[PDB]
Symmetry: C3
Subunit: 217 residues, 3 copies
Amino acid sequence: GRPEWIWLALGTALMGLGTLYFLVKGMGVSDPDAKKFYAITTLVPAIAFTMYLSMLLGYGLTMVPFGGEQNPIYWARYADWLFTTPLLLLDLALLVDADQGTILALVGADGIMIGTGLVGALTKVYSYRFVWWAISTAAMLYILYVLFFGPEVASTFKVLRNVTVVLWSAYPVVWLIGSEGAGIVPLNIETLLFMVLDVSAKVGFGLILLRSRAIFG
Amino acid sequence: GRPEWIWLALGTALMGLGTLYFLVKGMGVSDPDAKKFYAITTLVPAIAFTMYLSMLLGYGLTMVPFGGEQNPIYWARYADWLFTTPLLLLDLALLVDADQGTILALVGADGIMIGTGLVGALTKVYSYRFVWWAISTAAMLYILYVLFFGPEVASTFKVLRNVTVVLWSAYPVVWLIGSEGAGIVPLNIETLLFMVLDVSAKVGFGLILLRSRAIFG
Amino acid sequence: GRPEWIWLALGTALMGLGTLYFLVKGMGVSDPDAKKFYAITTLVPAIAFTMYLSMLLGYGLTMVPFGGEQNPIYWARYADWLFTTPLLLLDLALLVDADQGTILALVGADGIMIGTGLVGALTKVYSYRFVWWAISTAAMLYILYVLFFGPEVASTFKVLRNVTVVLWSAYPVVWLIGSEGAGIVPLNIETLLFMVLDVSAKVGFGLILLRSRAIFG
Ligand SMILES: *C/C=C(C)/C=C/C=C(C)/C=C/C1=C(C)CCCC1(C)C
Ligand SMILES: *C/C=C(C)/C=C/C=C(C)/C=C/C1=C(C)CCCC1(C)C
Ligand SMILES: *C/C=C(C)/C=C/C=C(C)/C=C/C1=C(C)CCCC1(C)C
């Protein structure tokens, strides 16, 4: 029905498989630290899976009036990211044994990032949408700042940090030019971009982490 | 007005009394571990109380169109379970000194279980409701799996585990045959079943736990 | 447009500045304990800032029918308080090294306090609104009870405790006489009162705490 459906179906499938793979891979792990990383990393795509399914079936989709039109907004993404983005930061923070003050800063900022993103997404005054985008972006930049200025461990963290910064930074650009923002890129193509980003930031990120010896004490 | 009102009133009352009883019972406890179990166990029915009240007054009730009808759906249950089910798992996990990786797995899975349950409850495409029910059930079965394959302590945990598995497993069956699912059992009877299950899984479970010497260090 | 706009604008500004001040002030802190207090205390007004902005732009405002009228209800306050009030309790609890059982009690009770407040705010049956207000108030009184009956540290905690009790206690009175309750005080004046309370309980509270040597190990 909706041209973006194929990407949602493929997104659902790839999150589903990634979840199952990490579930299997994690069986037999007894190391307490390793358990933590498997739990976090498996839960990410499991949640993403349910929200991709939500969007595919049309449950995670609403219409937001602005700019003199009914704009199709997939709210289910913010429900996803609200839980998955903090968990991904938690993998990075636990990897470097970050202290609780820094964890709370990252989680807090993340919560704000997604929350303002959501408000932006559903705002009916076109111009205001972008005020929310700017605040959320500030919060993202704060997160990237902490990650950078807040041997196997070092090495794996550096790789996952670089992966994070490049992928996460693309989301505000996609949002801004997409159907939630300027509407210069059509929803179908926006949906494809977000699937590639999400699968890379969840399953891609997850394969790198769970194959490393850093997760083990 | 609504025939199920009596069960909601009785549910409200019994959660209310259970909360007060556990509040009193917990006064004077100085043991740090015991405090944790009293806090968790008292908070469960306190939350359940407010949501039963919500449903009784009609605040926690919405109409969901599907199958060519306006179906009365008490959404307030998912608001309740979203917080109470994780807390009940937290009692069990703390009882056996489970590690944080296992706690996060259980909490995560629980969140998914209830979240998908909620989406199912509010889904307007009849057939899709059951896709959500199946996912949520998978998550429940994962939880039951971890509880089983993930002396006073051992003994009390075994009793509370068995209580949990039997009561929790009935919820998907009640949902499936109830007004949220197949609609072969009328809402009034469905409401009665859920009250008996909820009071047994919260106050019943809570009496067993708070009377045990396992809670003490 | 709305006469209360000036207070929302001023509220937004003052939370914004407080956030920036605490962000700057916190740079260079290396002490793990101090980090925790800076993270918590900076995040409070940051969240408050976004919700004040929400209300100013009109996003955090809905109309609730009751008493034969369309009543303008700023729901964005409960979204704010839901996260900021627990964080403020967390500052106090960490200050006195409270145990996890007490933290969970305070957080739990807080969650209930705000949650019932929200339900009250949006309830369409006028008389029921006040049942919810009474429950939420009970939860508040429980919180105040725990704070009181549950040298620099002692001294700073006593000052912040006294600040908390006096400011927090005014909220139910403002709600009750305001546009959410009895409607004897007009929304503009209610909005002013809440701004003064919020800025005092967040920035005021935050200046006292972050200037103390108690935050340091
Ligand atoms: C699995 C999903 C991931 C890792 C998603 C990350 C999402 C972001 C970093 C989104 C950022 C946004 C902004 C900074 C501006 C406002 C719009 C958002 C929410 C797309
Ligand atoms: C106090 C409440 C308790 C212990 C409730 C537990 C609820 C469940 C285990 C519900 C499970 C469900 C499924 C597995 C399938 C989908 C429908 C649900 C949410 C009823
Ligand atoms: C930054 C905000 C703060 C510290 C707000 C605290 C809010 C309260 C203590 C609100 C309490 C309420 C009641 C006890 C009764 C019901 C209405 C409420 C939610 C206003």
